[PDB]
């Protein structure tokens, strides 16, 4: 099982630099090219560069010469990409991928991708979120079923992890994308259960904000 594991989200200040890592496993690291791809605001991919860890040979997209520097540590099977002097356009999700093209064969092998690393270029300060429980009053949906909610607001930067009952309750939940407003994000999640479950059994909202090292569990009380 071939696997590419990337580093976590990063909050960078304008003008500074970051080194992203792409740890590989399950294949001979030195025999395949690793490419880096960039994705901004959804559908919009750009090819950055590729490195052949076996030799250290690299090829860059003219647009990125001077912006990205690719390296690879054979002893640890980790490819790195350093971005220098970050600006607005640099906020994006970066992916690493063992593309799989074999030049000599003029054919391809399966492509493996990393999960992606989100880079945020901002000078705004890190803020812990407030987690508020949403118990129904009119948001009851009447009997039969009842939906509860969880409001996570005023945090920076992304991401925040929200689960219900420590991951146990995964069906019927809707976690909405966080929306930025005035340097702070807001995110909400709703969970629809049967009238028999709640308030008979407890429903708890779990939230984690790594950047602040904030972890909070809110119990949806009536």
């Amino acid at each position: 099982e071939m696997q590419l594991q990337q580093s976590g989200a990063e909050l960078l200040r304008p003008g500074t630099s970051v080194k992203l890592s792409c740890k590989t496993s399950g294949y001979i690291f030195t025999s395949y090219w690793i490419h880096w791809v960039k994705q901004r605001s959804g559908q919009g991919l750009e090819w950055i560069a590729r490195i052949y860890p076996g030799t250290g040979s690299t090829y860059y997209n003219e647009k990125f010469k001077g912006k990205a520097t690719l390296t690879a540590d054979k002893s640890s099977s980790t490819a790195y990409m350093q971005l220098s002097t970050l600006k607005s356009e640099d906020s994006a999700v970066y992916f690493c991928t063992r593309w799989g093209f074999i030049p000599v064969r003029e054919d391809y092998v399966m492509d493996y991708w990393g999960q992606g690393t989100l880079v945020t270029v901002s000078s705004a300060k890190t803020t812990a979120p407030s987690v508020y429980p949403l118990a129904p009053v009119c948001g009851d949906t009447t009997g039969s079923s009842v939906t509860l909610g969880c409001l996570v607001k005023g945090y920076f930067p992304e991401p925040v992890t929200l689960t219900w009952n420590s991951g146990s309750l995964s069906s019927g939940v809707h976690t909405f994308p966080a929306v930025l407003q005035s340097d702070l994000y807001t995110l909400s999640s709703s969970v629809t259960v049967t009238s028999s479950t709640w308030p008979s059994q407890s429903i708890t909202c779990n939230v984690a904000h790594p950047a602040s090292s904030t972890k909070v569990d809110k119990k949806i009380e009536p």
Partner: protein, 219 residues
Amino acid sequence: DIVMTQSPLTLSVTIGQPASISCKSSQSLLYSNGKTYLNWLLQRPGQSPKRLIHLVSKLDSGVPDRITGSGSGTDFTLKISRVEAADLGVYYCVQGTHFPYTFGGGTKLEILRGDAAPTVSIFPPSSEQLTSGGASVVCFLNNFYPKDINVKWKIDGSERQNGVLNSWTDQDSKDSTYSMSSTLTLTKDEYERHNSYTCEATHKTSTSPIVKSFNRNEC
């Protein structure tokens, strides 16, 4: 660089029907060795992209042959003979014949289905928030189709436009429906000066706006 134009931008197809996506390039993708390096990728919601086809028509291992690729020169087409729920996502063409490699803008494939009216839930401010001097009234409009919906908040009969924060989820790969959240944030003081808070929606499934409200008061 080579410009790759994909059309359509989005396509709504019912499960079982065929779907085809076009990709045009500013230069022939025929390489000097006679091979044409055109690839098609699929990025599933919340997932990294994955290559479906390479060398114009060669399927990658583990890719269902419901998917077909074809074309030459500057015009290429990806065809899904019979679409399933797993085909939901954005498709891209990537050319590797010319340097640097360039991608198409993407084509979002959405599963067309039977209309579904929203299930609305409205929630008053939690005790905790009010303590901080803030008040948010949340409204959830779950599982509807089509995605097109218009929600407006009304306090004591008047439309409130300032302080509204909306968020929509992508098409659910389980029921093909959409859900959206609308939060209206006020100060504690003003919240306690009004009575009725109404979450009003406009959707295809109703000739009249879908309403959900509550009257805040005391006791």
